[PDB]
Every structure is written in structure tokens, then in C-alpha cells.
DNA sequence: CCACCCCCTTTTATAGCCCT
DNA sequence: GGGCTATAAAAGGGGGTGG
């Protein structure tokens, strides 16, 4: 959803103004990058998700909590 | 002739001619929201009647959400009393009704394919882009939204008697395009 | 974000109930990470409003080369969908045409009832 | 411990106030059991106190006072008045243009004290709500000691004089954090010994800024019993009236309303009648001044409302605010005068809310000739044409505009006229020659009420010549609609005028029986059906009307499905039993279909004992709709329990048991468990027991016969074994 | 260097289709 | 119960091209 990405970004006071073209482009880019990274973790196999975060230097930014 | 259209929204403009402190008003009132990056005005709301006014700097106010005409002026005068209660010199210089949104229900269904044909240069109808055509009446300056079901909406009139005159002109046009 | 939107995409062997709530928490965290870096990108160019071009530079700095290619192609497809969404007569001469259309329709209306 | 987790999760994730309310109520009840985890409770409760949601703050404070049974507070209070230029608002002001990790039990009380002067208003309002709860259960103390800040007074005093945060959400404005601070100051006053607090707050009323006076008035609005210098406080309270700030006159008049005024009463009226005569478009202070005026005329009955100043109370009847309309009718209730009598009849015809007009209707039923003639002309007028400006004293944009009457509709306009018409019937009425379409429908009833203390149907075309409504609509489509007669037509006036025509024909024919049957079928308005039936019953009492052929068709009216006749039986109720037609029902099969719609009217009277055979016949055909009507009577409920306990009918019980009294529910606990263990209707017997278990703790009704009352006492004591 | 647009937000009725 | 698309009207700050 487009408005779901817009309501979350405008919620924080530090962000403030967010364009219509920026919210729409990120809505498809974030969902596609997450489904491709989660799909690779399924190909390797709960414990396999933590293994995928250590295997990729790029996916090392995530899995910081819970 | 027929039934009378019932209005739901009234937009108004009030001039206060005074440099208003957006931060002070937003920090003093609980019912007022503000975000400088998102918007350049303080958004204040009233419970009785349910109205929302956009308070900009240099004493420029836009009252929206009122159902009736008197209610829009009665709300504007209440918003002016709030600003004056904060220490600012409030003045009710002018009041202008800018938009009157009305909704009218007609029992018979409309075939928009026919009306868009006769008013080819007045209407722009798309099937899946938006349900309904964009009717544009030159004088009175009123933009009407006609739907297949029957319920229509009139918006753009600055005077109340304009929507009543526009309905009496659009009703016989809706009959032939059944 | 809604969890069902991420759950349907992840399902398309059964995935775990505890992992279904964890993947959604990771999905919401990825959005806050891309937006925070973009907020720094808008501030670096002194622009108050978050631009689509500023958001694209934030994706490259994070470490997503494959995601940047999909963003540039989807934006062009979105621009073509937004762009796709002469009578000659003056304001007074076009008024006479419409007022005739109101008068003609009233006469047909009278003939009916 | 697992249950505590289930509580605060709901208290933070839930979207409804109702769910959070029961969750908070469940925790504050079993708080005696979960006492072991008091640091965890206080840990999660702190978030509720510091929540941006106004609801969560009062729920959070509620759990704290439920923990105050364990703690013991201190009596060291430092009363110091210090003036600082630092103003407290909603935020730091950094958003536009240091909470500690609470794990120790003493961490909570050390942080909430610091929060009393935090930059965020919701953190302060939360902290003052927490403190007010601590001193609410101070009497019921414990052993563990907690030393509250002795600087608490200086914190409250500072908040009242420095905080400049208000809420203009509604016409009556309030300071959220300053109100919670003023209320705390009231709750800690008995704990403080000899002080100057009560006098100091009177000094706030003379402060230049209205926000300081507002804090002064609200504090005294809590310490109104602790004041000993009543003569000194009232002196300023009278002067506080006629203030530029609308909220200052509102609070002052409301506080002066509690204090008795006998010495300077005339000085009060001078300021009260001045605010009304000021003629200000929007005023909140007007409703409070009228409440203060009522006190002067009630305590001192010698005085009366001036004639010249009576002209100022007239536009109050058409005020948009209901709180103003409520006070006016509560002020002129004792006094009776022709001048106000006209305006009271104008509220009945125009004003939307029925709550405020019922207050007016009762005054009329408690009468001069001039008003009877004046209002009979407005009722006689057409419903499609709105009310006239110069004819009415009070004016409103609704009921007077062509577009305005379309919003209320034909049914509402007639209802307002019919309600006023019932008040005219009570006192004597003089017949007048002045007549107007719907003028003959009211004048024919007016002449009939006159006759109580008939002209036949004339040519159908004669009404088209005299009336205005029939004249505009075509007779070619009107006759075709009459010849159908039900089938609707494309024309917009054929259907509404057919209802107006049927109304006029049945009313002129009154007392009539053949024209009255079709009236109850097509009449869109329900209030007129109550007025028409109010006539019939008055004639049956004086034995002027003879209705049997109409009564026979009226019974078959509800039995068929025509709900219109229901309006007649609501008026003519208990009288139907005493009538000879009641014997005829004891043979008709439609009685089950009839009483399925008219049971609520005969169940309210004690004469339900005579209709006892219908309950027996309702137990036979097992039609819950009729049985649920008798459950309202304990005698018919007791007779049912004796039948249900002997012969169990699970599929019927779940639909009748909960409609009856919840005092007989513990009698069914033992036989229902027998069915579930024995797999006898397990699905249904478990569903019906699921209704009984929550209503088990219900208080036993002492009105029950010793036959069943002793059984309930014997069964509840058995289940009490645990 | 400001003018002309364009974007952004507030409210409101209207409506199938789709999703939570 | 919200998102999708669309209309009118005021306002004013922030942007990209033009005379």
C-alpha cells in the first residue's frame, strides 16, 4: 500500500515533508528487496534467517533486535 | 420542481490582519496541531460544531467542515475569540463563503455514456479512472459530479442560490440521458 | 504496515507462526532504515521536501545495487501512468452553446411530463 | 505473573476504551494477589501515566491507588509561595523553529515527582493524576514507607501561576494540567495545618492575566467547603462578573451559584441582565448567568422578572446551543404569563431535540384564547410551505427556508404540530371561522373535541378548487393512483398528497370506521396515528363512539403484517381486555401472530393475570416473541422456571432464560453439567451454560416465592463449596 | 530576480473494487 | 473500516523554468 508508507514516514517529526513520487517509488523497492532477501534464506534451509544475516555483508545491518 | 439538494460542506475565508505567532498558538492550545516542514499553518478543531480551521501567519484563516452557512460564520467568530484569548489583537475584517459542497439523490439511474457524448467538450468521463464524469457548468460557475447510481454532488458555488439554480438546469438534462 | 500483505508474499513446507510475526517486524524495520538515510540525503542537498532522486541516492549508499536498477525502471513506468491519467469558442460563445443545451432539454422534459 | 503480562499488553495494544476499562478493572480487583510483582506493575504503570493518550493516564493512576494499600506516605509539607518567570506549555518548543530506567520500587516515586514540572504537558497531567490517587487511599496505609517531596506545594503553586496551556476543544475552555494540579491541592488541604493557601488563591482573582484568574477560580471550585471567609470571597466574585474573558464570567457565576447571596443581591442582577442585553452573537457566559438568576428568584420569592427586561429573554428560545434552551424553560416553569406562553408553543413546533421540547409540552398540559387561535393558523397551513417570519416571534434558518423543510421532511413537521395539538385539547377552546389543504384535517378534530365537551364525503373535485396542494398536482395521475390504489407513480407529488388526502377524508368522516381502515395503512407519520387514536379512546370512555367493525379489522391488521394499527393498541390497551372482543380472541388462531407484536402493552399492567391463557398457549406453540413479554412479570417467570426445571428444553432455554430474571439462573447450573457430561445436546447445553456462568454472581431477588427462593439459597450454597 | 505554475494539506459528499 | 481515483475553494511555503 502507498498510504501505509506515507503515514509511517510523516509520523516522525524529524522527517517532516515527503513527496508523492518518493513514497510511491520506495513502496515497491522496499517490498521487492525484502521478498528477495527472505527468499534466499528459505533456499538455505527460524535459525536459517539468522544464518543469512551473517552470510551476507549487506544483510548484516538487520537482525539487530529480537 | 422535484426534490431539493442538501449541502454537507462549507469553506470560508476570514482576514485578521495581524502577525500571528504559529509556535505560541500551537504550544498553548491542546486542540491545535502544527508541523512546519509538513505545512505552514496551525490546524485547530472544534467539537460543537465539528469544524477545522487552517490558521496561517499574518492573520489569514480558512474555516472548513461546517454543514450550514450560519454555522460557518458562527465557527469563524468562535476561532477569532480563541486567538484573542491568547493575547493577539484579533479583528473580524471580512468573511467570504468560498465553497459550498452539496449532495442530491435522484431515484432514476443515469447512462453516463450518453451525457458525455452530448457534452463532449463539457464532460471528461473515464470508466475505471474514476466512477463518474466531471460536468463543468460555465455560468453559474459550478463543477458537478454525476454518478451511475443516481447520487450527484455540486461543488464550486460561492452563493447558496447558485446550487438551486444549477440543479433546475441539470435536472432536465439528466432526464433525457436515462 | 499490514501484516497480511507481507504474509501473502512470503507464503507464495509451512512457515512458522513465530517467524511470521518476526518477518513483519523486520519488514517494518527496513522501511524506517531507508527513510532515515533519505532524511539525511534531503538535508545534504539543503532541500526541505524529500525528493525521489534523493531517495534513489540513499539506496546506493546503503549497499543495494540490484534494488537501485528496479527503482529507476518502476519510476519511469509510474511517470507514464501519471501522465496518461480545443473547442475554439470563447467563454461567452461556449456559454450560448451550453445554455441552448439546458433550454432544449427543458422542452423535451415538458413534452414528457 | 503470566496474567500481569496479559494485562499491560492489552492496556497498550487495544484500540477500544471499553476493553481497556475492563482490563484495568480486572487488575485493580485482584491487585491483592499480584502484590509480589509490585516493581513490575509500577514499571509498566509508569508508561500508562506518561502516555500521550488522555485515557491511559487515568487508567494508570487507577492501578496506583490500588497499590496504595501497601505503602505509607509522609506528613512533611513545605508551604512556600515563590514567583518565577518560567512558563509551562505543551512542549520544549524545540520541535518547531531524561527518564530513568524504573526497576527499583523507589525509582517510580522519584521520577513521578520530577514529572510534575516536565516540559511536556501530558507528562505533567499524568504525574498530577498519579499524586491525586496516592492521597485518595492515604487512610488505608501499610508498613513500607515512601517519602513524598515536601516541595509538592511550591510545585502546585508554580503550575497554577506559570502554566499557560489551555484546551479550546469545546465552547467551555479548560486547562488540563492546571485542573489536575488544582484538584491535587484540594486533596492535600486537610493534611496541611494552619495555612494562607485559601486566602492566597483569592489574590489570583485580581491578577491582570485571565489564565491566573482561571487557576484561581478552578482551585476555589474544589476547596469551596474549606473557605471560612465567605463574605470576603463573594465580594470579589460579584466584581469578577462582566469580565472581558467569557470563561471568567462562566466560572464566577457557577461558583457564586453555590454561595448564598442575601446582602448584595440587586448588584448581581445589574450585571446579569446586562450580559443578556449586550446582544453578542456567540456567548458561553449566558447559560451560567441564567442559572444564577434562577437562584435569586427561588430563594427570595418576593421578586419578579421586570417587564422591560423580559424583552431580553425572548431570543433565548431560538438559541442554537441546547444548554441555554434547557435553563430558560427551567426558569419560567413556576411563573405563568401570556407573553412567554406564545414562545413556549414555538419550541414545540420548531426545536429539533425532543428532550428540551418535552420540558415545554408539560408546561402547556399544566390557557388564554388568543394563543389557541394564533397557533391554529400555523398548523392549518401547508406542510410543503415553510413557516412565516412575521407570524413567529423567534426566527431560525431551519423550518423557515424552502430547503430547510426538505431536511426535516413531511413526517417531522406534522409530528411537531400534533404534539402541540394534544396540549390544546386539555383546556377550553373557542371555535373560529378562519380556514385555509391540511387545515380541514385539524379543524375537523378541533370541532370534534369541542363536540366531546359529522359531515359526509363531498365531491372529489371540490377539494381541488379550495385547497392549494391538490391544485398544483395533476388530477389525471392522482385518479390513477387512487384507482390502483397502492402502486407508486413517477410524479413526485402523487404519493405524498395521497397520504394528505387519506388523512383529510378519514378525519372529516370522524367518528368513522370505513375511511379509518385505509388511514392506518398508508400514513407515513406515526405521531398523527397516536393523535387519531387519542380521540377514539376518549369517545369510548364517554361512550360516544361505537367501534366493533373497525376493532375486528384492527386485530387482523397486526396479524397480517400491517404495523400501522399498533399505534391504536398502544393508546387503547387495558380497555381491550374489559371489552367484549377479548372473549372472541380466545377462539381465533391469529392470537399468536397478534400478541407477537402487541404483548409489551398488556404486560405492563397487573391485568396480565386475566391474559394468563396466552402464556399457556405461548408455552405450547413455543414462540419466544410472546414468552419474552411475560418474563417481564415475576409471577409468569416463576411459572416458567417450574416448567423448565421439570422438563428441560435446551434449544428454547437459551432464548427465554436470559430474557427473564438472572435470579433463577443458579437453578440450571447442576442440570446443564449433567447434560454435557452425558453428551445430551452437548453443543447447545454448553452454549446455554456459557450464558449462565457470567451471570452467576447476580444478587438474588427477595420478591421470589419461598417455593423457588429456598431452592436458589440451597443451590447457591452448594456451588459456594469450592 | 521575481513571475508563473506545480506541489502540499484541510474538509466534504459521492462509489464500486479490493483488502484487513 | 479504510485506501484507490476525482471535484471545488481559500492559503503559503518550497521548488523548477521563463522574460
Numbering used by the authors:
A (entry chain A): 15 to 59, 69 to 89
B (entry chain D): 19 to 196
C (entry chain B): 12 to 23, 29 to 101, 110 to 137
D (entry chain C): 1 to 97, 143 to 411, 415 to 484, 487 to 503, 510 to 778
What text comes from the article?
Mot1 dissociates TATA box-binding protein (TBP) from DNA in an ATP-dependent manner, thereby directly regulating transcription initiation process and global redistribution of TBP in the cell. Mot1 (modifier of transcription 1, also denoted BTAF1) is conserved from protozoa to humans and was the first Swi2/Snf2 member for which the biochemical activity has been demonstrated in vitro. The crystal structure of the N-terminal domain of Encephalitozoon cuniculi Mot1 (Mot1NTD) in complex with TBP showed that Mot1 consists of 16 HEAT repeats (Huntingtin, elongation factor 3, protein phosphatase 2A, lipid kinase TOR) that are arranged in a horseshoe-like shape. NC2 is a heterodimer composed of α and β subunits, which highly resemble histones H2A and H2B, respectively.
However, the addition of NC2 efficiently stabilized the ‘substrate’ complex and we obtained crystals from selenomethionine-derivatized proteins diffracting to 3.8 Å resolution that contained all five components: Mot1NTD, TBP, NC2α, NC2β, and 24 base-paired TATA box-containing DNA. In the crystal structure, we find one copy each of Mot1NTD, TBP, NC2α, NC2β, and 24 base pairs of DNA, in a semi-compact complex with approximate dimensions of 100 Å × 95 Å x 95 Å. Mot1 and NC2 occupy opposite binding surfaces on TBP and completely encircle the DNA-bound TBP molecule, which recognizes the minor groove of the TATA sequence. Furthermore, like in the human TBP:DNA:NC2 complex, NC2 locks TBP onto the promoter utilizing its histone fold domain (NC2HF), which is bound to the underside of the DNA, and the C-terminal helix H5 of NC2β, which reaches around the DNA and binds the convex side of TBP. Of note is that no interpretable electron density of the Mot1 latch residues 98–142 is observed. Therefore, it is probable that the latch is ordered only after binding to TBP's DNA-binding surface. In comparison with the Mot1NTD:TBP ‘product’ state, the interaction between the Mot1NTD and the convex site of TBP prominently extends towards the C-terminus of Mot1NTD, engaging HEAT repeats 4 to 10 and the insertion domain. As a result, the interaction interface between Mot1NTD and TBP's convex surface increases dramatically from ∼900 Å2 to ∼1500 Å2, as calculated using the PISA server, thus suggesting that Mot1 might even have a tighter grip on TBP in the presence of NC2. Interestingly, the kink of the longitudinal axis of the DNA duplex introduced by TBP appears to be less severe than the ∼90° bend observed in other TBP:DNA complexes and is slightly underwound bringing the upstream DNA closer to the N- and C-termini of Mot1NTD (the ‘gap’ of the horseshoe).
